[PDB]
């Protein structure tokens, strides 16, 4: 009855999608194909056919064809609908203009068609889960192009997006500040709630708690896969206090332009050291509010919380959650904003987290994913804006963007909008 349309754009989203759909297949008993050997649970993400083939309700799009071609040759080759896997001719070359103006104009009309064919096949539409990179290229340009198309064809339907936010120090491309601001400008009015994750932060977690000194991108994607499963667990599985995708909007978004919650997953613990831990509800819940465990390298205590969603799993007693949150409320270090006395949204689900074979996480009994909207993120946007100002003062790389359909005016408009956003964060952080 419930459904979610997953669009995976770019290399980061596509590669993250493989981790996500490797986990959804595991949790639902699927066999790496559409076959379930000899139920209303899997219906949320998988469409069914008379032959017994369960087809993912996802669209893989990339102007580059290398990463999606790997899927067509990998273990999940027979899973996805061949037309869902859409590949372009040439990549965006880490340029926002190419993804949005030049190349995206030859693929958006094709991907939106498959979204149309998927939307009308659903008994009831619930929202969108968009996976993309904030660094640039297809994840910045094409996502903005596709997001605006959805906001017109599907309007008020929920549109959630998961983004790999640029790291403070680590960086893999030279023009990320240009692309990051450009996509932010064109997605504030078309996105309901965007969840942020940073490569640098998860590297620290994978080395600070998981005892692994050689994290790859595969390890990070699996950690991200668990978060999305926790978010969508309510639709897939029964629970004591269910939370829907449309609930995240009004719970975490106080104002339309401030919709960037952080992300956290508490029991990120190695198998060996899990034998010396109780892993009770109070300790995992307290772990969420520690800076050392955040998935985005932004210290929460630099600002005030304004919305927190605790999504529990497994053997969790609501009495423990009530007490656990109350003691957190008592602490003076964890400072919420004055205008939000009602700051916690609680979701409890009975299905425990499933460990992907060959993974690193332990066989945890109970897990909690925290989605916190904090004013501290304004500092990260300030850092990002500062990088843009330096490069743009010299017009460091503008000739590339201007030469592929874009105009100089967009740089001024894009940055001015971000300045307003930073100012908006200041207003919300003060009372009376």
């Amino acid at each position: 009855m419930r459904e979610c349309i997953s669009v995976h754009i770019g290399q980061a989203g596509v590669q993250m999608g493989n981790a996500c759909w490797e986990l959804y297949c595991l949790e639902h008993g699927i066999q790496q194909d559409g076959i379930i050997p000899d139920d209303s649970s899997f219906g949320t993400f998988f469409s069914e056919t008379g032959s017994g083939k369960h087809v993912p309700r996802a669209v893989f799009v990339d102007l580059e064809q290398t990463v999606i071609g790997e899927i067509r040759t990998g273990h999940y080759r027979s899973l996805f609908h061949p037309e869902q896997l859409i590949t372009g001719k040439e990549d965006a070359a880490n340029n926002y203009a190419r993804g949005h103006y030049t190349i995206g104009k030859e693929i958006v009309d094709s991907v939106l068609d498959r979204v149309r064919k998927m939307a009308d096949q659903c008994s009831g539409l619930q929202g969108f889960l968009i996976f993309h990179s904030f660094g640039g290229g297809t994840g910045s340009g094409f996502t903005s192009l596709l997001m605006e198309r959805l906001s017109v064809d599907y309007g008020k339907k929920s549109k959630l997006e998961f983004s790999v936010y640029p790291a403070p120090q680590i960086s893999t491309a030279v023009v990320e500040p240009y692309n990051s601001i450009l996509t932010t400008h064109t997605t504030l009015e078309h996105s309901d709630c965007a969840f942020m994750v940073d490569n640098e932060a998860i590297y620290d977690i994978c080395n600070r708690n998981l005892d692994i000194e050689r994290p790859t991108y595969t390890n990070l994607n699996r950690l991200i896969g668990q978060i999305v499963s926790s978010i969508t667990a309510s639709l897939r599985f029964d629970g004591a206090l269910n939370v829907d995708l449309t609930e995240f909007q009004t719970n975490l978004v106080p104002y339309p332009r401030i919709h960037f919650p952080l992300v956290t997953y508490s029991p990120i613990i190695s198998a060996e050291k899990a034998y010396h831990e109780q892993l009770s509800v109070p300790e995992i819940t307290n772990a969420c509010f520690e800076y050392s465990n955040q998935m985005v390298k932004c210290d929460p205590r630099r600002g005030k919380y304004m919305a927190c969603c605790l999504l529990y799993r497994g053997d969790v007693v609501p009495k423990d959650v009530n007490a656990a949150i109350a003691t957190i409320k008592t602490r003076k270090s964890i400072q919420f904003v004055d205008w939000c006395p009602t700051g916690f949204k609680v979701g409890i689900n009975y299905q425990p987290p499933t460990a992907v074979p060959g993974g690193d996480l332990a066989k945890v009994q109970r897990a909690v994913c925290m989605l916190s909207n904090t004013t501290a993120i304004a500092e990260a946007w300030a850092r990002l804006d500062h990088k843009f100002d330096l490069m743009y003062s010299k017009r460091a790389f503008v000739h590339w963007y201007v030469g592929e359909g874009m105009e100089e005016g967009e740089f001024s408009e894009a940055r001015e909008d971000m300045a307003a956003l930073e100012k908006d964060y200041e207003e919300v952080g003060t009372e009376s």
Binding site: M1, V317, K319, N322, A326, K345
Partner: protein, 430 residues
């Protein structure tokens, strides 16, 4: 005669409702398949209060299960006593409310309420003598708060003279299950103060203390809490279903418990409540049941009665007892705690004694209290609401569905009036 039609709403209402019918069916001897297998014949005499008869001895609850999403109902029918319900009564939509009162009331439930009434009227018209409507919901969400209040307005406009009673789960002070509770609660209260005769307020936090202190329950699930709520729901409707020395109809309670029209918010309680290891240390007699019923630590609402005065009180006893003990004990409470009772009401206790107790208990008693101390709950909500409303915290979600800021001010003003009214009648004559 004196039939009651049960109306579910939202996840909380459906969850409690499912437990409610498990309890009701137990004391009436109805199997999960609908068949009757009870021993006593008294439990079948007045079975028409909650059930409609079908061929082959099948008894169908007169219940309507409604929610904007299919999931909670799908869980209800899959769980125990889920097939007992009539399938036609599962009136549900597809796109749920996102915990915003506006969507469930104005946008999403507005197009579904018409279908719901088509089942309510059909159930109502099948009664020989309709007594009232029973609604189970929660004030902290969208569906229960929004859609539930919409049904209350529709039914009260369509059945003006029938008694409407609601069992609402109220937001707790200590911690929240939803960021927009103050908006949902204040708007919902604006409709209850006008279109219901008796609302039984209960908060999850209080029930946790009962499980922790009295029952000594170390792993309290939501099913455990719903049992406590179901117990009080059954208790207030025993005189309609079983004989007793001194009966008390639902309306009989409203007259004795509602002095003024808008002071009809009650905080319930139940007894006996003891742990498994402490049961062999109790006499289980009338004197001690009444001793814990008036205890502030045994009431399913957060508000402490010690902070205000009781306007009225009701004690519906169940089981064979000495009426002398009941009358004396009620008077004893009146005399000792005369400071806790409004003086311009000479008698503040209404007693009802039913002959048949709940299964497994020789004696039982349900406590209902209309106290001026309940203004603490409403005033706490008002403080939370004004803080958010003072700088347009989340109104774009509500105003985006069609609501207006004028409505929010009206809801807040009415809440303040109710709090003030409770304070006015807390002072003595002249």
């Amino acid at each position: 005669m004196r039939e009651i039609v049960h109306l579910q709403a939202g996840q909380c209402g459906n969850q409690i409702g499912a437990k409610f019918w498990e309890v009701i069916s137990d004391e009436h001897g109805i199997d999960p398949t609908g068949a009757y297998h009870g021993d006593s014949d008294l439990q079948l005499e007045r079975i028409n209060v909650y059930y409609n008869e079908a061929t082959g001895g099948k008894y169908v609850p007169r219940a309507v299960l409604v929610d904007l999403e299919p999931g909670t109902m799908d869980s209800v029918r899959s769980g125990p006593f889920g097939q007992i319900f009539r399938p036609d009564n599962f009136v549900f939509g597809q796109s749920g409310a996102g915990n915003n009162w506006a969507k469930g009331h104005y946008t999403e439930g507005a197009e579904l309420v018409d279908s719901v009434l088509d089942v309510v009227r059909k159930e109502a018209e099948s009664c020989d003598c309709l007594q009232g409507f029973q609604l189970t919901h929660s004030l902290g969400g969208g569906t229960g708060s929004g859609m539930g209040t919409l049904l209350i307005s529709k039914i009260r406009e369509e059945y003006p003279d029938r008694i409407m009673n609601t069992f609402s789960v109220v937001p707790s002070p200590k911690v929240s299950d939803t960021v927009v509770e103050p908006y949902n609660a204040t708007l919902s209260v604006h409709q209850l103060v006008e279109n219901t005769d008796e609302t039984y307020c209960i908060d999850n936090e209080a029930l946790y203390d009962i499980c922790f202190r009295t029952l000594k329950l170390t792993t309290p699930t939501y099913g455990d809490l719903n049992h406590l709520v179901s117990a009080t729901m059954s208790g207030v409707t025993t005189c309609l279903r079983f004989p007793g020395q001194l009966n008390a109809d639902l309306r009989k309670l409203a007259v004795n418990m509602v002095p003024f029209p808008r002071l009809h918010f009650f905080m319930p309680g139940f007894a006996p409540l003891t742990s498994r290891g402490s049961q062999q240390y109790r006499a289980l007699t009338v004197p001690e049941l009444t001793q814990q019923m008036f205890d502030a630590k045994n009431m399913m609402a957060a508000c402490d009665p010690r902070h205000g005065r009781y306007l009225t009180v009701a004690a519906i006893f169940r089981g064979r007892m000495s009426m002398k003990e009941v009358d004396e004990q009620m008077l004893n409470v009146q005399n000792k705690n005369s400071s806790y009772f409004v003086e311009w009401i000479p008698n503040n206790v209404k007693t009802a004694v039913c002959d048949i107790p709940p299964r497994g208990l020789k004696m039982s008693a349900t406590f209902i209290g209309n106290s001026t101390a309940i203004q603490e709950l409403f005033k706490r909500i008002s403080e939370q609401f004004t803080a958010m409303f003072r700088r347009k915290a989340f109104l774009h979600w509500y105003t985006g569905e069609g609501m207006d800021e004028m409505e929010f001010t009206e809801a807040e003003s009415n809440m303040n009036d109710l709090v003030s009214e409770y304070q006015q009648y807390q002072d003595a004559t002249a």
